Nucleic acid binder design. Structure first.
Lengths: 89, 92
DNA sequence: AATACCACTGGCGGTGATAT
DNA sequence: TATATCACCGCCAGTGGTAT
């Protein structure tokens, strides 16, 4: 698969690190998160591990489950989500 | 590969509301489907497919087109506007 | 367990030409 | 023209099976 960009790989590392810090307090695993995003565990592993790119919807759903802001792992997707909101206001 | 899914009733109605706005506003704003395609970085058949309900709007596209046509997304697509506000709830 | 690896495919979001 | 509607398909996110 084409490598993702270094910024995209950094967002995936910040995202997975939050999951490792919060997984026991929030009672999570890759398969339960898979279920909440209606996806499979290997679909989640690919996002956590910088194999498949994060998009604005997946990131927004993961930020909600993990109780963090999107900007905590992806400043650029958070930038994007804010631009689109300028169009609904 | 070949596959394309048919749009839903809702996606067709959004498309139909977006083309209407464009027709109501194109020369007051000085727009054609190829100026718009250029604005959006694609060709006139790309825009053609969106206005004519062949390809479905996504949130990024719907937000660029809203800004350019100076409407809010909800004027042609409440469900994408609701989807965009649900994403915003995660950055605020 | 819980997660990672790997080959694979559906459909997203287009393209250019041509017909109207 | 300006638009609509062909035929066409690259690409990669997500899969599901299996291994660690």
């Amino acid at each position: 698969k084409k490598p993702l960009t270094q910024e995209q790989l950094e967002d995936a590392r910040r995202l997975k690190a939050i999951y490792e810090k919060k997984k026991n307090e929030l009672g999570l695993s890759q398969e339960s998160l898979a279920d909440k995003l209606g996806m499979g565990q290997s679909g989640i592993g690919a996002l956590f591990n910088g194999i498949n790119a994060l998009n604005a919807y997946n990131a927004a759903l993961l930020a909600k489950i993990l109780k963090v802001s999107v900007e905590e792992f992806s400043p650029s997707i958070a930038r994007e989500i804010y631009e689109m909101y300028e169009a609904v206001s």
